[PDB]
Subunit: 464 residues, 4 copies
Amino acid sequence: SMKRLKDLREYLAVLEAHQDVREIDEPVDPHLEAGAAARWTYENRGPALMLNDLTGTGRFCRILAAPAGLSTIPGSPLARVALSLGLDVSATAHEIVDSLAAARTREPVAPVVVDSAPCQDNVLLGDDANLDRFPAPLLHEGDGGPYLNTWGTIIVSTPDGSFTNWAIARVMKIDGKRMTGTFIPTQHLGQIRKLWDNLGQPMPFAIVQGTEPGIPFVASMPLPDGIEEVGFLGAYFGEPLELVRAKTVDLLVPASAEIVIEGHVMPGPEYVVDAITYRDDPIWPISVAGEPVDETHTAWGLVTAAEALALLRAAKLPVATAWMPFEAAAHWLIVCLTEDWRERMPGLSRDGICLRISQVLAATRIEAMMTRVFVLDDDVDPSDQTELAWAIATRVSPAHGRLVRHGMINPLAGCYSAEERRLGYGPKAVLNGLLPPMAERSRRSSFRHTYPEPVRQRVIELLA
Amino acid sequence: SMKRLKDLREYLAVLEAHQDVREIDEPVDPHLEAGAAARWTYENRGPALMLNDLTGTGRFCRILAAPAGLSTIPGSPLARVALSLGLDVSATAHEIVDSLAAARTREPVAPVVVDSAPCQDNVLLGDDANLDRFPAPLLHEGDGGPYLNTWGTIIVSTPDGSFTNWAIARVMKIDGKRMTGTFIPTQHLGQIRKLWDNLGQPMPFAIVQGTEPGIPFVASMPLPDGIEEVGFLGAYFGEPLELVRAKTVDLLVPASAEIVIEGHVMPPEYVVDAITYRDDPIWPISVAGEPVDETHTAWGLVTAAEALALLRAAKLPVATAWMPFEAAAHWLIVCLTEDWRERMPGLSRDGICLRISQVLAATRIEAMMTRVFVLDDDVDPSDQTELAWAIATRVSPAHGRLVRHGMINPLAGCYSAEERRLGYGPKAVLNGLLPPMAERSRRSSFRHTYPEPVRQRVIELLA
Amino acid sequence: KRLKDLREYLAVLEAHQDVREIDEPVDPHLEAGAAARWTYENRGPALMLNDLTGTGRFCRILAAPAGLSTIPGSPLARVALSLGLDVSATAHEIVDSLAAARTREPVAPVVVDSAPCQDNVLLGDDANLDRFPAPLLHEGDGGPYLNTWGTIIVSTPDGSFTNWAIARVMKIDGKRMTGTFIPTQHLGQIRKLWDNLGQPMPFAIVQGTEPGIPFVASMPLPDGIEEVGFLGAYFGEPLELVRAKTVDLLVPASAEIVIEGHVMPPEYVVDAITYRDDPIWPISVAGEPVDETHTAWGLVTAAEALALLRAAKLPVATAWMPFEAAAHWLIVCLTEDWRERMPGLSRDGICLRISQVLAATRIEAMMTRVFVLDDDVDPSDQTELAWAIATRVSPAHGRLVRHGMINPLAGCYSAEERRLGYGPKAVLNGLLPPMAERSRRSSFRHTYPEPVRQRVIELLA
Amino acid sequence: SMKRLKDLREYLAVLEAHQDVREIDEPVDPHLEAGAAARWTYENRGPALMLNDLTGTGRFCRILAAPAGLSTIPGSPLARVALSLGLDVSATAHEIVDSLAAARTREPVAPVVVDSAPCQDNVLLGDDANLDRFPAPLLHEGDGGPYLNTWGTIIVSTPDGSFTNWAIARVMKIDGKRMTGTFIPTQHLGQIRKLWDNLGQPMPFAIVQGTEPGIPFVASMPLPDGIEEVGFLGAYFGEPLELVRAKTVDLLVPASAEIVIEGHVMPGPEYVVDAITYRDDPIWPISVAGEPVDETHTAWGLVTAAEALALLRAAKLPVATAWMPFEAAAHWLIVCLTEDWRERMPGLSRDGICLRISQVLAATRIEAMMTRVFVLDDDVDPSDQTELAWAIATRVSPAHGRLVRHGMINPLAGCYSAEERRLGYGPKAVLNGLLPPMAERSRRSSFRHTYPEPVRQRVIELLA
Ligand SMILES: [Mg+2]
Ligand SMILES: [Mg+2]
Ligand SMILES: [Mg+2]
């Protein structure tokens, strides 16, 4: 039933068919212009951009901007997300998070190793394996340097080869042979690196760009500790991902990649480039994070809502859907309960079920970033920004129904004081916007909710 | 400088010129279909509808649906509000509330009495003055009966004639001669009803429909106690309002009306004595419900303009004020000028929120403000995405909330049954102010993170 | 059993060994105030300071006139005796007596031909405040506080309303004094009427009256209620007054000293000072608990709250301003059957209603916190009260916050809240669930059958 | 410098010397009268009671009631606590918690094994080891049965013998050979019984009554996971505690005990008695928990404040003292900061230091029972109930300066709803009652704070 797109070329051919990708043949400077073009695209809900000619490297390597920004397809703003996750172009916000959460109840599917892949048609070794051959975009005026990895995946394995992590972490260019990035000890990349430091050996790595579109979504997903992204991807699409052996490092990489950067991480934390392999006419996708709406919101926040939905359902909570509204910049989670939630959780009041949701979320990886969690009924679509704001304004008390917890916070969230940020300790709220029992509720006043179907059908016939 | 539209025909001709009104010649049943057509229009941002043919009364009286709903005019969703208030079709949310607040600093302009008006071309008296000859729309399935007044103005004078109140209150049809409605004692209509009840005499009234488009906005405005709407309308437009004498009741009604329902209120039922109308009458309706309708575009908007005027009169550095339409007239956004600290030394962010709360709490409008968000003026409160982003990223999940308990809006949704029954519940003032300009982090977007040459080069490539 | 003057009051305290005479000289400059603080804080007897540096044995000073009593098992005895009750009257019986008088018609006073307070009469230059002690009660004060436990009689220009207020009056020199005339109080309002006519307001300050007067003088009665009428209704008989020698004002015949004068528009001016042989000038040295700020002002404010809450038909068993909370907290105890008496309300609902009723009254601004509790706890028992708040008030919910006018002297406000006169006040819900749904209390009285308790009392008491 | 009382007889001889113990020679019924006599004693601040004749067992076994209740010694209400912890009869609230916290910075002192002890002068085995030989007091109405362990220690060890826990937990009698009690998995006793259960073996146990008076205080103390109570006692007193081998179980028990009950815990959980040993004329102390003031407040709450003081100081916080007020029934912790706290914690505001205190406490075992923590200055004595209430009323804002955290709660605390108790999830607050800087403060108005020393000395001469 899934319609999985197997590489970036298939993804781009589907966006072409829906007139949702534009080619720019005029030269664009990776120094700020490429990043600015990506921001213009996100903010004006423009087509994805194929930057065909870049200052410094010419037409050698293309750049794909806004790979999963909001779509131009009429009535389908989530189309790039839907297609990236093998769903219909018009799949809803609920169908998307439900598909991802459903795969969390399935057994992982191991990948398969292929003899060859287009990502190894061109191989650069030794002094030829130089990043100066590719664009080094300075994405924002104030950045420390060029961010080479914003929509690509870092691949590392434990020394024993028992666990392989695919993660999306920012990587900054130092020079043609060296890059750097953060190895936070609370995430897998850093935990795996510590195992390589204990054995006194450089950690082999590979960074892939322009893989099949579903990979960066799963690489952004806060899966539990023992779950490999490749296995989850396999369970999600219902078939094994095809991997190819890296040329210089005993790692398996997606065969769908446009570019593969291979090397070793040395404490010097520096990534040292040993080889670069790429398919003919390579494409390097970028993601330019900032205010809504970009892949921070359409990918990272969205897959975090799908993980919350899976965790809440695993705790046997009657959750209809979960969503991280794009306008709230991945600061809010909306939890919608089924209409029969009281029958499914018999001893709890509205405050009681909010206490239980808080208790369940508080025990997970993702709790620290939830600055606010709004608990609402499923008569509200949390992906409809007007209906969501209306529900919060009219259903959340101005004083009560707020559960405040203090603890770890997202250091990048905006709603914290300087001392809260410095201590890494601040407030997170769970807000109760649930209504009284369905029979006790006042009828909703709108076209859909206040008129009989024959009257609505007659009006649609006259006006639509 | 204002471009006032003197009646409903001028208003409709301007909407026609901007392709923002659609004529429906097929019959529409006032029983639910008219209300449903109005809701479809609001919710799909459709053109205003001129319901030309209505079952029961045919083509006699027309109905105007979504008279001040969101506009179809590209890039100008507030165009119906702007044109209704004599402004340019493209006037912004700020220009609109600023125009209304500016008129609060001006002296009232007394109206002028004219000898005749089109609203009296046809006069029905005695048994002919029957509301069954006009449409009686059942606007929502669950309503108690037909709501005859939703976008019309009820004119009422004190027994001494020293004060003339123009108000917009709900009026439900009982039969062809009788209507009923709420006379809340905290409003001028319920306060003036207490003066005519004390004298044991019936209160004369006159309800007008389809007046010039600016009247229902001022009728909805919570002006201070001693301020007549007619005087404010005169100060706003910069010229006197032309009134005509009522045929049967000693009240001065707008000469721009389509229909004038004259009568007297018994000690609460409205009893019809006369119905005058101009040729080919138009009866506008407003079908209140979820965003966005005239509850939001008129009532909430004029309440933000009054808050802006009151806050400025208290010498507060308020750049703008707005009642977001998506929040259903439950929230007020107060944006402070960038130099508010220089203008209000030596208050902290919490200090200025305390002062705003203290000022608002002393006014008429405080009870309906379920939440007030105090933000900086780098946020447009009429941009729903930017507003939600500012609240999510700038209001603490726990602190910077001033809670006050007292009178509430009995129709607001965020109250318990006991809070509604007591008429006593919580109202919050939320602090979403940034630290000083120099201390602030740079905003990350196309406009805020790139040099002008880089933005201009990108606009050249992509626009 | 009303005590008609300060000598009757002092004779009753003597009979209960609750007053001590200090014949050794005490300096009005700080020592008298320090002796009063030692007394309050050590729950010592009231002090009769006979010899005072500067004036000697002329005018005596009564310290801790209504401080906590030394009488075993009766700490509220000075309050009880001051209000004509039994020496052992409880916290509840005291506030209930005062609240009961609020349901009664005022009793007009009677004018007598003479009084002991006019046995001596100083006029002109003889009317010098320097003849009497001028105590500097606290190190940091601006000057001597002459009025701390006396009453300021004032009438409107038309003579239709007479206010008996207790306000702080500071000595400037031998003839002039100064004090606060807050416009939200009667003394500031009655003053505005005299300013509108462009005339000085005649006044009269009395010291050492019958002990019940300073309690009613501290009570926040409604706007149209005279203090002398309430006193008359409280005691059930008219208050005997006398015409002031130099001003058109009637003053208590029970006074020790009467200081008559005029208020030029804020300074005061003395005309005459009349007194009875061997005068006594009582003082009140306000500070940390427990003094007359707590035993009189806070207590009478709880009695007024009890009267207002009952007038709103609320099932209030008692009300109290705990002394340890320095007149910052009001405790409202509901009757056990409150749910039957207020049928549609939840615990939160009755707290909303109490808040709504209190918010409409004069006294709301000083209630920094109001705790709504059941009547199974005594709010005058500081241990039981703290236990009830700790175990029954949620650490997060059941708090109704209101913002508005505040007591500018309350401690729990920021500098900006004080400067704006706008800050938070809370109503806390500490009500238990329905009587059947409750857990049994674990203590001697609540966990054991009466035969078992009686057998234990026989063995151990 | 310590003056340790090595058994209950030494403790009782010291209370006799201070006229703080009374003997009852008239028979007292263990069914409710003994418990009622203990409550009368606590509530009237009476002497400790030695009940010499108890209905059913006569003069065989005595009962000591209110072993650490408030003392009758003039000016020394904490004397039973002070003497129990080897301090002077007049040691203050601060000196007591400071002594206990100081021992937390010291190395544990291993105990010593002795050949014999008075607690084994009489040995009952087989059918003779029957609890019906001793009083079985029904302490309260509501109690499911007789509570045999209220002021005694439960001694258990791990199968490997690497860790020995001395615990004070509820033990209710079933019959003459069987008892039951709670084995909370969050405490050591339940964690240790799981290890015996995994080996398919009953857990050996010993319960001791009437040991030296310091033991029940340390058994109530929430020490960290790897710290044995016997080692802490040794470090506290500055000398090894003397133990004797148990007769029928492989455990070491205090040689100072009046009574040893030895046996094995079975899952079907029930304590089964295999031997009872006791010294001549045994004394069985009881603690009758209820409203203030009993050993719940004078021992458990007090040692929890000492542990909080030790943890806060280990986090380098400038804490002058910590205390759990007796009137607040072990629901509140008061944290008093030193006057110079701002100099010692330079970048923090009053709210900032409260956030830091909350963060430190939240990382510890004791967080859950802290329904409220009040952060005050050290110009307030938190053991003075009037001054404490005055400080909270006048210094804590009616709305702000409250940090709320949600999580684990004390299931026995009163201030929780039925749903919060059932979920084990509810609110806990940290309240900011700190004054502004010392120069910015208003002077305190009282005898001590508003008058010069010569004026105070002159007044004391006149009136004292
Ligand atoms: Mg991952
Ligand atoms: Mg008064
Ligand atoms: Mg332990």
